[PDB]
Motif scaffolding. Structure first.
Motif, PDB file in Angstrom:
ATOM      1  N   UNK A   1      38.935 -16.450  51.395  1.00 31.13           N
ATOM      2  CA  UNK A   1      38.625 -15.974  50.091  1.00 31.13           C
ATOM      3  C   UNK A   1      39.032 -16.784  48.945  1.00 31.13           C
ATOM      4  N   UNK A   2      38.309 -17.052  48.147  1.00 32.47           N
ATOM      5  CA  UNK A   2      38.390 -17.576  47.025  1.00 32.47           C
ATOM      6  C   UNK A   2      39.383 -17.273  45.794  1.00 32.47           C
ATOM      7  N   UNK A   3      40.570 -18.194  46.252  1.00 31.30           N
ATOM      8  CA  UNK A   3      42.124 -17.586  45.343  1.00 31.30           C
ATOM      9  C   UNK A   3      41.783 -18.017  43.575  1.00 31.30           C
ATOM     10  N   UNK A   4      41.284 -19.142  43.286  1.00 33.62           N
ATOM     11  CA  UNK A   4      41.208 -19.612  42.172  1.00 33.62           C
ATOM     12  C   UNK A   4      40.004 -18.749  41.396  1.00 33.62           C
ATOM     13  N   UNK A   5      39.220 -18.534  41.431  1.00 35.88           N
ATOM     14  CA  UNK A   5      38.189 -17.322  41.249  1.00 35.88           C
ATOM     15  C   UNK A   5      39.280 -15.656  40.331  1.00 35.88           C
ATOM     16  N   UNK A   6      40.032 -15.822  40.768  1.00 31.89           N
ATOM     17  CA  UNK A   6      40.843 -14.788  40.679  1.00 31.89           C
ATOM     18  C   UNK A   6      42.237 -14.432  39.658  1.00 31.89           C
ATOM     19  N   UNK A   7      41.892 -15.851  39.627  1.00 37.18           N
ATOM     20  CA  UNK A   7      43.153 -15.854  37.984  1.00 37.18           C
ATOM     21  C   UNK A   7      42.783 -15.432  36.811  1.00 37.18           C
ATOM     22  N   UNK A   8      43.826 -14.627  36.346  1.00 36.61           N
ATOM     23  CA  UNK A   8      44.502 -14.239  34.925  1.00 36.61           C
ATOM     24  C   UNK A   8      43.937 -15.231  34.243  1.00 36.61           C
ATOM     25  N   UNK A   9      42.863 -15.344  33.445  1.00 37.44           N
ATOM     26  CA  UNK A   9      42.320 -15.815  32.006  1.00 37.44           C
ATOM     27  C   UNK A   9      42.988 -15.927  30.799  1.00 37.44           C
ATOM     28  N   UNK A  10      43.605 -15.549  29.684  1.00 44.37           N
ATOM     29  CA  UNK A  10      44.205 -15.583  28.849  1.00 44.37           C
ATOM     30  C   UNK A  10      43.214 -15.846  27.826  1.00 44.37           C
ATOM     31  N   UNK A  11      43.035 -15.067  26.967  1.00 50.78           N
ATOM     32  CA  UNK A  11      41.208 -15.456  25.598  1.00 50.78           C
ATOM     33  C   UNK A  11      42.170 -15.896  24.848  1.00 50.78           C
ATOM     34  N   UNK A  12      41.825 -16.838  23.605  1.00 48.68           N
ATOM     35  CA  UNK A  12      42.146 -17.327  22.300  1.00 48.68           C
ATOM     36  C   UNK A  12      41.407 -16.989  20.798  1.00 48.68           C
ATOM     37  N   UNK A  13      41.726 -16.776  20.298  1.00 52.02           N
ATOM     38  CA  UNK A  13      41.642 -16.559  19.573  1.00 52.02           C
ATOM     39  C   UNK A  13      41.605 -16.818  17.602  1.00 52.02           C
ATOM     40  N   UNK A  14      41.485 -17.630  17.082  1.00 53.73           N
ATOM     41  CA  UNK A  14      42.133 -18.814  15.504  1.00 53.73           C
ATOM     42  C   UNK A  14      42.054 -17.971  14.731  1.00 53.73           C
ATOM     43  N   UNK A  22      41.900 -19.649  28.886  1.00 54.71           N
ATOM     44  CA  UNK A  22      42.544 -20.513  29.329  1.00 54.71           C
ATOM     45  C   UNK A  22      43.806 -19.467  30.277  1.00 54.71           C
ATOM     46  N   UNK A  23      43.598 -20.788  31.735  1.00 58.07           N
ATOM     47  CA  UNK A  23      43.429 -20.114  32.936  1.00 58.07           C
ATOM     48  C   UNK A  23      44.983 -20.611  33.175  1.00 58.07           C
ATOM     49  N   UNK A  24      46.285 -20.478  33.959  1.00 53.31           N
ATOM     50  CA  UNK A  24      47.291 -21.579  33.845  1.00 53.31           C
ATOM     51  C   UNK A  24      46.783 -22.049  35.240  1.00 53.31           C
ATOM     52  N   UNK A  25      47.960 -23.333  35.823  1.00 51.93           N
ATOM     53  CA  UNK A  25      47.743 -24.427  36.624  1.00 51.93           C
ATOM     54  C   UNK A  25      48.070 -23.553  37.893  1.00 51.93           C
ATOM     55  N   UNK A  26      47.236 -23.162  39.014  1.00 56.57           N
ATOM     56  CA  UNK A  26      48.027 -22.315  40.608  1.00 56.57           C
ATOM     57  C   UNK A  26      48.570 -22.704  40.464  1.00 56.57           C
TER      58      UNK A  26
END
Length: 50
Positions: A1-14, A22-26
């Motif tokens: 099963x796909x693993x990149x689709x299950x990373x935690x993406x952080x939201x940004x709002x300035x 934004x999500x980290x490089x796995x």
RNA sequence: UACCUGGUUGAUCCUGCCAGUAGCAUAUGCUUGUCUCAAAGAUUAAGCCAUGCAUGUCUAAGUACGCACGGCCGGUACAGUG
């Protein structure tokens, strides 16, 4: 099963800056380039023996 | 340039030193208009030190979820500068 689709993406709002996620490089992930490096190493062993 | 000269005596030869003489090196005095090169807290104290600086470093290629900036879809892991 796909693993990149299950990373935690952080939201940004300035203030004023449009919002973005934004999500980290796995790391330690298997990609075509890792397999390519392994195959090239194996082939180098082949040519050495030959 | 392989060089000498004054001084012992009333005068003379001689030993012999003192002094003269030229360079070089450090200090110092007086003087000093151009121009080129250039030594320089060794000698006394390897004595004592205020302060500032004198050793840092990233490529395509170790690690980037710092919006710190930034893209063309903010439902395509990592766009890039960093």
């Amino acid at each position: 099963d796909d693993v990149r689709q299950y990373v935690v993406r952080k939201p940004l709002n300035k203030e004023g800056k449009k919002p973005r996620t934004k999500a980290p490089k796995i790391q330690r992930l298997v990609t075509p380039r890792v397999l390519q490096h392994k195959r090239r190493r194996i082939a180098l062993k082949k040519q050495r023996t030959k």
